[PDB]
Symmetry: D2
Subunit: 295 residues, 4 copies
């Protein structure tokens, strides 16, 4: 037998950082969960019980805190790139670092119509994420994403004209509820190293904001022919607005809301045009994915 | 042996309702999870296998949908009271109904600074809840709550002057992070029946909004001496603003963020006045409760 | 305003203890999650910012570890009673301690038909729990429970003869699936203090084992007329076997498995006597409760 | 823009099947959660709103139940292969099916030392899983796994001789707790189609049992030099016992249990050789992965 692939490190490292402006008194907080996995010339730790090649996962944890102390933690694309580069430069035998960051929302509170200097609210479990792969001699690959963005529209969704055969019971519809949890990922062109990542810093927050805005607007405004057709429109627009993105991937559950026939009870009308009360279905759910790239 | 207490019913009934304004085209959605448990002269179903006394839990589920079709579902205090009253009036042998409702957020989307007519976002897992107990000949008892409101302040929290003995290692502090998930419940004076609940309908949404506003403002503005002292201030204000409330209860975790001493690494300073990077602790957590009533 | 009730302490304190037999080499592990909440003359911490009355929750955490070091942690009824008694005896102004313990399963592994001396498996998320309330001058009240015991029987469950009215669609049945997650609690007669709890130590593990055995056997063997009738049989037997128990409470979800009509597809028969494939329903669920005491 | 990749289908389809032996009266239950995603000539549904190419996800759900009715559901490798093959053969334009199955435990109850004919218990949240990829003209690729197997050993784990630099605080140890949740996957050689899968049916359950047995025995018996070294031993043995497996992958968290220094309290000794009470850490955790193949 032989080791075909190996990676190891520390998962679920929770980190909080505060920035304090002495001038204005304003404080800003960042909270993330970080995972770092390393690869390199480490097979002997598996095959020969040779621990001399192991950077302890406890040390990886320490390094995350030290790096957060000495560097900006925003945008997460930059922080992940700094963190990953550290490992491949510091350790001769480590040749790849894989950094995943989940950013948690701490939104400044408005109190009496004024932004509060040091108080924050978690407005939704929506996350902003990054995956950064730093590979010695091959640069830095960054995938940015948003996830956990949950939306619903109560009309202006249709689904008709699908394949009908002996397995089909679904009725065509011209008016239904559409609800989903959005997972959207944009993949950046490969960067040569940290200097190039630094040169593009302003694009990271801007592109996240664009991706979010395009998602919300298209969802709200499209008279949707299917999840497939609407998601494609989203992806097309993001690629049009940021030339440094190579691909956009969406993964979308179709969270079903079923009509409830109440006609058995006193002829009560609650279907089609008369539908008012629905039963949200926890499972099963449709799952629709697509990756859109350039011609 | 004897049956000392019994209740039974249907839990986790998900319900969605849409309201459509024909004039304006504007649609509004409500989504809830409902539980209804009944009590009454039902002991023989347990002791003698006498099912004749059982209103099937499946029928309770049907009744929830039918009631939602025929009545407003907002405010939840009113809907719960209608639903509970139904069971005690319809069935001679049922003498109490216990209705719990969790309301899920569907907030109208703003697209290009305009409220969208039929598109919604789940902004946070914060819930608005009601517990309604309808007891034949004893009226309607309603407890209203908000839960899952997660907040953090990065300064203006202190904790010093506590008891110190041979079990104590905690250092006094004049500047710490304070973060919690707020669970706040206000208990209404007993109502004689549905007519009285109806007469107070406007107070329900208003008092929820007040409770939320008081919680957020007090948290942000109090230079907190402890969770105990700040929570008491919240409760006092709510009781002052709504005379029909008898008690206010808060239950608050103290979600700890620990300093990280980095001085072992190149004398790096990250404690006290120099603290920038902290480690959020998933567990254990403080838990502080209090019920405040009138003198 | 006035403080009507208050309690505070530390939740989610994870504790592991190992016992090592020097003679045999055999090791035994215990893992629990502990919550301790205190009550007493502490209102001034809420109303006057007087922290002098507060035993810090951090100190409560320390006390849990110290108590675990110096005392047996099994049975949990005894450990909870020791822990609770400590607080009311040590602090003059603390008059009640409320201790909740969840015990996690670590079952010794059998390797080649032999019990292994120091290796363990988590066989199911079933828990054994205790709630101990120690109240100065009123003794020790203990509620013991098992929870998270998930079972299913594929036949020998019936449900017919229930109330049928204009809200009813449920068909009577003489053969259905019955599945539940068992939550069962037995409440001990009040104990005068720690000496009395100590005198009954052997009864605690024995009664837990009896409660578990009675639950499983009755579930498997009863040709069940309803969840109500079967649960009552369980409770009756437990009360018959342990005279020091005052009440037994069961809380049981009815986790539904629905038939799937496939006759639309090539006349395929999958209902009634021909039912083979079913759809487990995540929600809603029936919820049936009962408390059984002595005549 | 262009569609670079697309797949869609139904997730979280819960399925239960019962087998009834008329001769013996013995009943056996199977419960699974199934996901099916399709690929093929479907880009026009995304780009042109052409639904004619879409097999509705609702129809995929129906097909899962119909297939379960007409075929054995065990071993899951066979059921997944039947299900996947169905889609690529039935629909000309569908060229790949991806089937994921999670099997839930329903273990027959022993009552008074006898196996009960129709009563079952969920003994642990451990799962047996399959991923089956059926690709037109390229055969059937099957990955089998077990997951959620949670174990702990209280001694006979060491970790010393790792890299020490200015980022390292971890002390070397010759005696520690080791606990993990095992995720192990074995990848079968590619099969030409359903006939070949059928020919190997007995190997599927046998290899699952071997993988489980090897995992448990090696964990219990290895005087572990690291998670890396012990996991490699597991993988090596599985590859030695089943020639039709090409690779074995393990992914293992290192769930830390920390010593608690209690010496501040009355010189209490609870570290090193005197360690009895430990603090389980919820996060962070080490994460160690490896894929082992043949020389
Ligand atoms: O078994 C271990 N492997 C590792 O890589 C490691 N790093 N810290 N502790 C550890 N334990
Ligand atoms: O056992 C049952 N008890 C009930 O009360 C009930 N209601 N519907 N199905 C039921 N099954
Ligand atoms: O606000 C607090 N209240 C308390 O009771 C406490 N105990 N430790 N830290 C604390 N913080
Ligand atoms: O938008 C949809 N896309 C689909 O593929 C589908 N299948 N059923 N319902 C559906 N809705
Ligand atoms: Na390197
Ligand atoms: Na009545
Ligand atoms: Na006392
Ligand atoms: Na095909
Ligand atoms: Xe951070
Ligand atoms: Xe969508
Ligand atoms: Xe609703
Ligand atoms: Xe607070
Ligand atoms: Xe313990
Ligand atoms: Xe039951
Ligand atoms: Xe199944
Ligand atoms: Xe391991």
């Amino acid at each position: 037998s032989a080791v075909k692939a190996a990676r190891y490190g520390k998962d679920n490292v929770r980190v909080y950082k505060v920035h304090k402006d002495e001038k204005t008194g304003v404080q800003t907080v960042y909270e993330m969960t970080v995972c770092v996995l390393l690869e390199g010339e480490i097979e002997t730790s598996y095959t020969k019980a040779d621990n001399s090649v192991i950077v302890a996962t406890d040390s990886i944890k320490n390094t995350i805190y030290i790096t957060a102390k000495q560097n900006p933690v925003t945008p997460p694309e930059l922080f992940g790139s700094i963190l990953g580069t550290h490992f491949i430069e510091k350790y001769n035998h480590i040749h790849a670092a894989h950094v995943n960051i989940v950013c948690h929302r701490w939104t400044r509170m408005d109190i009496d119509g004024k932004p509060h200097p040091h108080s924050f609210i978690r407005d939704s479990e929506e996350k902003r994420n990054v995956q950064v792969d730093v590979v010695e001699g091959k640069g830095i690959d960054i995938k940015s994403s948003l996830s956990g963005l949950t939306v619903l529209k109560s009309t202006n969704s249709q689904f008709w004209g699908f394949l009908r055969d002996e397995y089909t019971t679904l009725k065509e519809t011209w008016d239904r509820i559409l609800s989903t949890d959005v997972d959207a990922t944009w993949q950046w062109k490969n960067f040569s190293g940290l200097q190039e990542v630094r040169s593009h810093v302003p694009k990271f927050d801007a592109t996240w904001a664009t991706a979010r805005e395009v998602t919300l607007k298209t969802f709200a405004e499209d008279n949707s022919a299917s999840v497939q057709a609407t998601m494609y429109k989203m992806a097309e627009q993001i690629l049009a607005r940021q030339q440094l993105i190579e691909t956009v991937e969406y993964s979308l559950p179709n969270k079903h809301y079923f009509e409830i026939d109440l006609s058995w009870h006193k002829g009560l009308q609650n279907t089609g045009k008369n539908a008012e009360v629905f039963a949200p279905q926890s499972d099963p759910n449709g799952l629709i994915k697509c990756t859109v790239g350039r011609s």
